[PDB]
Design a protein around this ligand. Structure first.
Ligand code: CLA
Ligand code: CLA
Ligand code: CLA
Ligand code: CLA
Ligand code: CLA
Ligand code: CLA
Ligand code: CLA
Ligand code: CLA
Ligand SMILES: CC(=CC=C/C(C)=C/C=C/C=C(C)/C=C/C=C(C)/C=C/C1=C(C)CCCC1(C)C)/C=C/C1=C(C)CCCC1(C)C
Ligand SMILES: CC1=C(C/C=C(\C)CCC[C@H](C)CCC[C@@H](C)CCCC(C)C)C(=O)c2ccccc2C1=O
Ligand SMILES: OC[C@H]1O[C@](CO)(O[C@H]2O[C@H](CO)[C@@H](O)[C@H](O)[C@H]2O)[C@@H](O)[C@@H]1O
Ligand code: SF4
Ligand code: SF4
Ligand code: SF4
Lengths: 30, 733, 31, 154, 95, 76, 81
């Protein structure tokens, strides 16, 4: 296929954040 | 108006935003917040920092895991010539095509940033080598760092006891530790370096297969148990060595023999191990010192109690210092902090002049962004040390239960204590500052002469009674001979502790009037820093202005105006205030090494000599000389060598500056225009009904003394971070 | 408009396909 | 003699300092004062830092590299009064600053309302308790530690 | 030059002062008094200590040193062996 | 407000304007307009300013003006 | 505590002494003998904010109060709005 290891910066530095900024808006409510 | 945050309660239904911040910073204050019992608490710090050890292995794992498939190693173990190792692959979509420009560093493909941590000379320096042979790291450490969590839970679960009272022994534990732990923790290390590593160093490999078949010698552990040890240390190593490949190897573990080498500085192969061994009796001999049921040894009172050396007939008690250091848990976490604090620098000031690694200084970078992350911290501790021993005095402590008793008296005879402290500073103040302006009024004025400049006598002195065999000089009984030692000679001080002047890496650098100042201005730091911590502490209890300053002691920052006008007079806000001088010592000191080192490398040393005896110059050549490299690195003419660094370095100057708000602002002014600024929304369309769930406010009146700080700090500590690196790397040195 | 329990679905789905293929690419056109 | 070099009797590096550096001072081939009666680099400012020749006195004075002179003062070979001579001097002068500190002070707290006599000054400098200092032979070195300021008052 | 075995002689001088009491009266550990489970409560805390019990074998097992330490150290450890050597054994004087 | 407006004028007024004539009045600013592409970077503001100029402050010892460098430490 | 700052003193007389402080302090509750006989330290405090205007005037001879309440409503800071 050739040259393709780019997912562990969005799933982390991008999407993991989405989760918790969403999710953890559990501090406000759930 | 609902109910939320699951531990506190006053916090829990507070309608503002404080609701949030103050949630995320009471978390770790177990002792006294809703959910707590002396049984809860303890354990609630126990399976906490089992949540510790735990996070230290997901760190170390990955440290060994951005290394094994890229990030040169079956390189840098071919010969580690000072050209740019590697940490991990930098990958940001924001990068330009000058992805191609250095940043992208030689051997490896896509861009990267190289080990300035030491790891790379100790995953190597205990052998650990071959790139087929290597790719363990996480694999273990992590099949470890999970167990680290398992007790966490297991010992959190009631049943198979989490243990409650059993947390105030001592004797048993620490009768256990400083044997079980340290001793065998050493030993077992003594174990490893020696069977698997020393061989890996001077000699050859060890194959993952054999571990019995490999035998440092032909005829085994030979005598050894045969009290006959000695004949380890004969033809041990050599010097015509070629490090790692035998040939001039020889094979007789242990020594104190041979010494330095242009091919590696660093403590000899063996010595870091007889030592590791050698101490491993004493602690094991130490461990087994107190009770633990069987009925020997000692009760940890009854040798305090009426122990006492100068007490006896000097009317000055010693009562249950045990049930107060024990019933305290803060006394605990701050005799803990320090020791660590005092030794974190003993680590990191000995880690130079005596680095124990295969290529390190003669690396001279990693060596200079590693003395300091151990100078920062270390300073950073000390403070916290001094800060949990002004919490003991308020939450815990017990005047009726401690008195005539020597922890008291310490309180009682306190006004002197800060004074005969403050008298040190004020002296150590203007007297350093006469000498340094005077030294700067005289230059500029044309007269380099007239310059006031004291040799650091009692310094060099310590060293012409060592090895500083600098240009002769007797000393009455010593001469440079007649008497030498007589009682000592060809044993012990052989080639070692014989570096002398060695303009390159002699251990001891040859001290003059430049050093008889910084050295009095690191002394005006921890003194001033501590008149405030000593003070900070020596009445979190109260005083004249605030007499009854308590039931909460620590962070009650502020009080009403009137009385004289009262302010940052919580023992926290003196801690708060302290942390600026711990950030000013731990700078004079670090600042100093480097200028020195820098100059003492790819060039002179006269430089620090007549140009550190004054002040302007400390700014001009150093500070102003030696930044060069970095800043013309965003340059109007494309991104050259470093770019991370300089942008960090201005990221450095912003995070800092932006402290100040927090710091010259003070909640009053902020809250009030938010009173006007929360008349907007409510009064503006396409943004009405739209309810907050937390009431717009301005930061708490302690909170922002923190945040400006916890802000002042990174900026500051993230600026030298990028400063030194961004210039120990270029050089010239 | 079947919203009756969702959003968790559209935040794995939609946001694994604004980022799955969205980062990857068969022949760079690099950073 | 000690760590740096020897005094003035010889100090090469020091010599070069005398010379370039100052004398460049010179530096101005002329710059007009052929006979003229102001511009005084010319006379002294040099010669007052200069006629300070191969003499400065002679002072010993150690002089390291670059030959700027260092101060040992360990009371030996020559260097004794680079601290003590001007040391007791610092002591004696102060202490007779504050011997009188503890004086145009311990003379007031009495009579009638004495509540800030001090924002004005009763005898200027004290000019009464004045010489008490040179008129310290021994003094506090006994009467401080015995009586008056007596442990009592401690 | 070094009496190396001057002092390992010396240190298990003292921990045979250890071989002590696994043997002589009653059980282990003057039986677990207090170890697991946890003291009265005790509590300040707490005991015991006793300047008065440094006797018992001061005199007897102060010999223990000269045991191994004599004839079993510099004088070739148990020459009086044989007792099943053929998968091997010996053992053989490195001295 | 003022402290950065100052910072503005001289960096202009010398980056361009102040400079100098000679034959064919080939203009030669105290600085060939370094401003160009390079104040726009706010580091250029200590690359081109503060670290560039100021090299006259921290060279100023032993001179005649010297009282500036010799202030520039106090007051700084 | 939830509003617990001690301004007490010993006279608790309140003439040319102290009055200032939004609502909070409906005292004059004469304890059976303390000179100008009006005493204690407060009335029902669950009403207003966190001054130390509370002393500033008329003795507390010890401390004087300030913020210490933590549990802190809103009505207890201007801004619940
Ligand atoms: C706040 C921060 C903190 C951080 C982030 C670091 C980071 C670092 N320190 Mg460090 N340090 C700190 C605080 C910190 N330190 C403090 C407070 C001290 C003083 C106590 C030190 C004293 C110190 C020393 C002396 C050194 C470092 C070194 C290092 C570097 C090595 C990487 C590493 O630590 O892996 C850590 C590795 C582990 C946690 C695993 C090893 C632990 C072994 C000893 C476990 C033994 C248990 C064993 C299984 C028991 C066996 C029993 C049985 C088998 C017999 C790394 C840069 C080293 C260096 O110089 O790099 C160049 C070294 O010089 N540090
Ligand atoms: C090594 C350990 C040690 C241990 C075991 C403890 C344990 C404790 N400390 Mg403590 N402390 C320490 C070192 C330690 N401390 C040191 C070194 C200092 C200063 C040097 C302090 C200063 C300190 C203060 C002021 C207080 C405590 C308190 C406490 C207690 C509650 C903890 C807390 O409030 O955290 C909760 C904090 C958080 C959940 C996070 C908020 C913290 C902010 C300030 C972030 C700090 C900087 C950060 C890294 C920058 C952001 C990162 C950036 C890259 C984005 C707990 C008993 C509190 C206490 O109970 O005293 C009465 C409190 O007063 N400590
Ligand atoms: C560079 C800085 C500036 C200066 C000059 C000082 C100086 C001082 N600080 Mg300080 N400090 C500073 C910034 C400064 N601080 C900052 C930014 C913070 C944190 C925000 C602190 C936090 C802090 C704390 C917590 C403490 C101090 C203390 C002190 C004093 C310690 C005693 C000493 O060092 O010798 C004495 C002073 C000097 C060497 C400075 C020069 C003072 C003299 C020589 C003035 C010159 C006279 C001049 C000729 C006449 C001009 C005046 C006018 C007539 C024109 C000292 C006065 C401590 C203290 O109170 O000590 C008892 C302690 O409380 N500081
Ligand atoms: C370097 C500075 C730091 C910063 C960033 C600010 C910023 C501000 N100050 Mg201020 N201030 C500071 C230090 C700082 N101050 C200091 C040290 C003091 C006194 C010693 C003051 C005294 C002060 C007063 C009295 C006032 C302010 C006000 C303000 C605001 C003015 C309006 C504005 O333009 O803000 C927004 C713009 C900025 C902050 C600059 C741009 C920031 C960049 C980096 C963009 C970042 C955004 C981006 C999306 C980041 C997200 C990425 C993600 C990773 C997080 C602004 C918030 C005033 C105010 O609020 O009026 C409106 C008020 O008058 N300040
Ligand atoms: C006559 C005066 C006098 C005397 C005997 C002292 C004595 C002392 N002071 Mg002190 N002090 C003084 C005036 C005096 N002070 C004044 C005016 C101030 C400014 C507020 C201070 C501020 C001060 C501080 C912050 C400290 C001391 C400390 C001390 C003690 C340490 C000595 C030291 O190293 O500080 C050197 C002395 C000074 C820095 C004082 C400067 C003022 C001097 C020059 C007064 C000169 C006389 C003056 C003009 C009076 C007029 C004469 C009149 C009869 C007409 C010592 C007991 C230290 C302490 O408490 O530890 C025991 C502490 O660190 N002092
Ligand atoms: C705690 C961590 C330590 C640190 C500081 C890092 C940091 C990093 N890793 Mg990483 N990693 C680690 C351990 C660590 N790793 C371990 C133990 C593994 C093996 C499972 C990996 C496998 C790994 C891969 C495949 C990648 C990274 C990548 C990265 C980079 C991007 C972040 C990311 O998406 O990671 C992904 C991390 C994981 C999949 C590990 C999950 C394990 C859990 C337990 C850790 C979560 C801890 C958290 C702090 C709490 C970043 C530099 C990415 C990269 O190369 O970009 C440059 C690449 O995606 N890592
Ligand atoms: C705090 C102390 C410190 C000390 C111990 C000294 C000591 C000295 N200074 Mg000095 N100086 C200092 C701070 C100090 N200075 C500072 C901070 C400045 C800047 C304001 C100066 C600016 C300065 C100048 C310009 C000069 C001195 C000179 C001197 C010398 C002249 C004293 C004299 O004439 O005695 C004679 C009388 C007795 C001994 C009795 C003396 C060695 C003078 C000199 O000739 O060079 C060394 C010269 O005038 N100093
Ligand atoms: C800083 C000081 C202090 C400390 C910790 C030591 C420590 C030590 N000295 Mg020592 N020594 C000291 C002051 C100190 N000395 C002084 C003041 C003198 C002058 C009389 C000596 C003269 C001296 C001699 C002659 C020897 C030692 C030796 C030693 C070492 C082994 C002693 C032993 O065998 O048991 C040990 C590292 C011995 C040694 O091991 O050195 C090779 C032996 O040579 N010392
Ligand atoms: C041994 C030593 C030492 C030392 C010194 C020391 C030994 C030091 C110490 C230090 C310590 C510290 C510095 C600590 C601190 C801390 C603290 C003080 C605390 C406090 C507190 C508080 C605040 C309150 C309460 C609580 C607490 C306690 C925490 C040395 C030795 C030596 C030398 C050098 C010389 C030569 C010889 C030798 C032998 C080699
Ligand atoms: C600006 C300012 C405010 C105003 C409060 C503000 C501006 C809060 C604004 C929110 C900022 C924009 C949040 C950005 C921070 C991010 C890094 C996210 C934080 C994430 C946390 C959970 C760590 C104060 O209330 C105050 C109080 C006392 C002394 C000084 C000051 C002060 O300087
Ligand atoms: O003869 C006593 C006479 O001298 C005193 C003693 O202090 O001091 C003089 O010395 C100073 C030094 O400058 C002179 O200026 C002035 O004459 C006096 O200060 C003085 O008290 C006595 O009057
Ligand atoms: S901060 Fe202001 S208000 Fe608060 S206490 Fe100090 S002075 Fe008072
Ligand atoms: S001390 Fe204050 S308010 Fe208290 S009793 Fe007097 S005036 Fe009343
Ligand atoms: S001091 Fe307190 S109670 Fe009194 S008025 Fe102020 S806020 Fe109210």
């Amino acid at each position: 296929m050739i040259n393709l290891p780019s997912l562990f910066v969005p799933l982390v530095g991008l999407l993991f954040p989405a989760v918790a900024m969403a999710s953890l808006f559990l501090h406000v409510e759930k | 108006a609902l109910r939320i945050p699951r531990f506190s309660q006053g916090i829990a239904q507070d309608p503002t935003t404080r609701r949030i911040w103050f949630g995320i910073a009471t978390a770790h204050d177990f002792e006294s917040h809703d959910d707590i019992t002396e049984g809860r608490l303890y354990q609630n710090i126990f399976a906490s920092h089992f949540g510790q050890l735990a996070i230290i292995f997901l760190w170390t794992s990955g440290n060994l895991f951005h290394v094994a498939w890229q990030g040169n190693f079956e390189a840098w173990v071919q010969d580690p010539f000072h050209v740019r190792p590697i940490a991990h692959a930098i990958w940001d979509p924001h990068f330009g095509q000058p992805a191609v420009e250095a940043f992208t560093r030689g051997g490896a493909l896509g861009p990267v940033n190289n080990a300035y941590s030491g790891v790379y000379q100790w995953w190597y320096t205990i052998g650990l080598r071959t790139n087929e042979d290597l790719y363990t790291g996480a694999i273990f450490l992590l099949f470890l760092s999970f167990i680290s969590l398992l007790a966490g839970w297991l010992h959190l679960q009631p049943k198979w006891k989490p243990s409650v009272s059993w947390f105030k022994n001592a004797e048993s534990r620490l009768n256990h530790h400083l044997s079980g732990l340290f001793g065998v923790s050493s030993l077992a290390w003594a174990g490893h370096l020696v069977h698997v590593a020393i061989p890996g160093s001077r000699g050859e490999y060890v194959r993952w297969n054999n571990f019995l078949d490999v035998l440092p010698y032909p005829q085994g552990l030979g005598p050894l148990l045969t009290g006959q040890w000695n004949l380890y240390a004969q033809n041990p190593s050599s010097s015509n060595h070629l490090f790692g490949t035998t040939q001039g190897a020889g094979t007789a573990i242990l020594t104190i023999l041979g010494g330095f080498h242009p091919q590696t500085q660093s403590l000899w192969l063996t010595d870091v191990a007889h030592h590791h061994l050698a101490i491993a009796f004493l602690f094991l001999i130490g461990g087994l010192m107190y009770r633990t049921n069987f009925g020997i040894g000692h009760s940890i009172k009854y040798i305090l109690e009426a122990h006492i050396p100068p007490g006896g007939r000097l009317g000055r008690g010693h009562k249950g210092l045990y049930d107060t250091i024990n019933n305290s848990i803060h006394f605990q976490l701050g005799l803990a902090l320090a020791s660590l604090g005092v030794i974190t620098s003993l680590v990191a000031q000995h880690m130079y002049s005596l680095p124990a690694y295969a290529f390190i200084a003669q690396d001279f970078t990693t060596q200079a962004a590693l003395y300091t992350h151990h100078q920062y911290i270390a300073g950073f501790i000390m403070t916290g040390a001094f800060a949990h021993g002004p919490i003991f005095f308020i939450r815990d402590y017990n005047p009726e239960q401690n008195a005539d008793n020597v922890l008291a008296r310490m309180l009682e005879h306190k006004e002197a204590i800060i004074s005969h402290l403050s008298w040190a500073s004020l002296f150590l103040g203007f007297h350093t500052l006469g000498l340094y302006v005077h030294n700067d009024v005289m230059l500029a004025f044309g007269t380099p002469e007239k310059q006031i400049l004291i040799e650091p006598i009692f310094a060099q002195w310590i060293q012409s009674a060592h090895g500083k065999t600098t240009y002769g000089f007797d000393i009455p009984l010593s001469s440079t001979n007649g008497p030498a030692l007589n009682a000592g000679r060809n044993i012990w001080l052989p080639g070692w502790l014989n570096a002398i002047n060695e303009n390159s890496n002699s251990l001891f650098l040859t001290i003059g009037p430049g050093d008889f100042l910084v050295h009095h201005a690191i002394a005006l730091g921890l003194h001033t820093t501590t008149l405030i911590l000593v003070k900070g502490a020596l009445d979190a209890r109260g005083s004249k202005l605030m007499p009854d300053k308590k039931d909460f002691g620590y962070s009650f920052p502020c009080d009403g105006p009137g009385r004289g006008g009262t302010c940052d007079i919580s023992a926290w806000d003196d801690f708060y205030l302290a942390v600026f001088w711990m950030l000013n010592t731990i700078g004079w000191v670090t600042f100093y090494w480097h200028w020195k080192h820098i100059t003492l490398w790819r060039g002179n040393v006269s430089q620090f000599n007549e140009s550190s005896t004054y002040l302007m110059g400390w700014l001009r050549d150093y500070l102003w000389l030696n930044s060069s490299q970095l800043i013309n690195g965003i340059t109007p003419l494309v991104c050259n060598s470093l770019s991370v660094w300089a942008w960090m370095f201005l990221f450095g100057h912003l995070v800092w500056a932006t402290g100040f708000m927090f710091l010259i602002s003070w909640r009053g002014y902020w809250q009030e225009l938010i009173e006007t600024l929360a008349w907007a929304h409510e009064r503006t369309p396409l943004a009405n009904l739209i309810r907050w769930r937390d009431k717009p406010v301005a930061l708490s009146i302690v909170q922002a003394r923190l945040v400006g700080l916890v802000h002042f700090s990174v900026g500051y500590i993230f600026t030298y971070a990028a400063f030194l690196i961004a210039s120990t790397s270029g050089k010239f040195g | 408009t079947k919203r009756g329990l969702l959003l968790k679905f559209l935040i794995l789905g939609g946001g694994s396909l604004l980022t799955y293929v969205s980062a990857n690419a068969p022949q760079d056109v690099l950073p | 003699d000690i760590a740096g070099l020897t005094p003035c009797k010889e100090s090469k590096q020091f010599a070069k300092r005398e010379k370039q550096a100052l004398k460049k001072l010179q530096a101005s081939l002329k710059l007009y004062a052929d006979d003229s009666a102001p511009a005084l680099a010319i006379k002294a400012t040099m010669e007052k830092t200069k006629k300070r020749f191969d003499n400065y006195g002679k002072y010993g004075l150690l002089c390291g590299s670059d030959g700027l002179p260092h101060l040992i003062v360990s009371g030996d070979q020559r260097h004794w009064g680079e601290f003590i001579t001007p040391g007791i001097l610092f002591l004696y002068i102060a202490g007779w600053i504050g011997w009188v500190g503890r004086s145009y002070l311990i003379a007031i707290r009495d009579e009638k309302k004495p509540t800030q006599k001090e924002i004005i000054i009763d005898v200027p400098l004290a000019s009464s308790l004045l010489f008490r200092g040179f008129s310290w032979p021994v003094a506090a070195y006994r009467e401080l530690l015995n009586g008056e300021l007596v442990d009592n008052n401690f | 030059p070094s009496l190396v075995i001057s002092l390992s002689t010396g240190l298990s001088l003292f921990l045979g002062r250890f071989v002590f009491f696994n043997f002589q009266r009653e059980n282990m550990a003057k039986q677990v008094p207090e170890q697991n489970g946890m003291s009265h409560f005790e509590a300040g805390d707490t005991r015991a200590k006793e300047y008065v019990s440094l006797l018992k074998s001061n005199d007897p097992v102060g010999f223990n040193i000269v045991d191994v330490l004599a004839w079993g150290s510099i004088g070739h450890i148990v020459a009086y062996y044989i007792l099943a050597t053929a998968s091997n054994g010996y053992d053989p004087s490195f001295f | 407000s003022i402290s950065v407006v100052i910072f503005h004028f001289s960096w202009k007024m010398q980056s361009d304007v102040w400079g100098t004539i000679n034959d064919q009045g080939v203009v030669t600013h105290i600085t060939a307009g370094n401003f160009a592409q390079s104040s726009i970077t706010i580091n250029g503001w200590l690359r081109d300013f503060l670290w560039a100029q100021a090299s006259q402050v921290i060279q100023s010892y032993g001179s005649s003006l010297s009282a500036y460098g010799l202030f520039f430490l106090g007051a700084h | 505590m939830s509003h617990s700052v001690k301004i007490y003193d010993t006279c608790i007389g309140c003439t040319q002494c102290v009055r200032a402080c939004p609502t909070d302090v409906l005292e004059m509750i004469p304890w059976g003998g303390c000179k100008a006989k009006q005493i204690a330290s407060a009335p029902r405090t669950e009403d207003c904010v966190g001054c130390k205007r509370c002393e500033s005037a008329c003795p507390t001879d010890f401390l004087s109060v300030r913020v210490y309440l933590w549990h802190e409503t809103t009505r207890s800071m201007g801004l619940a709005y």
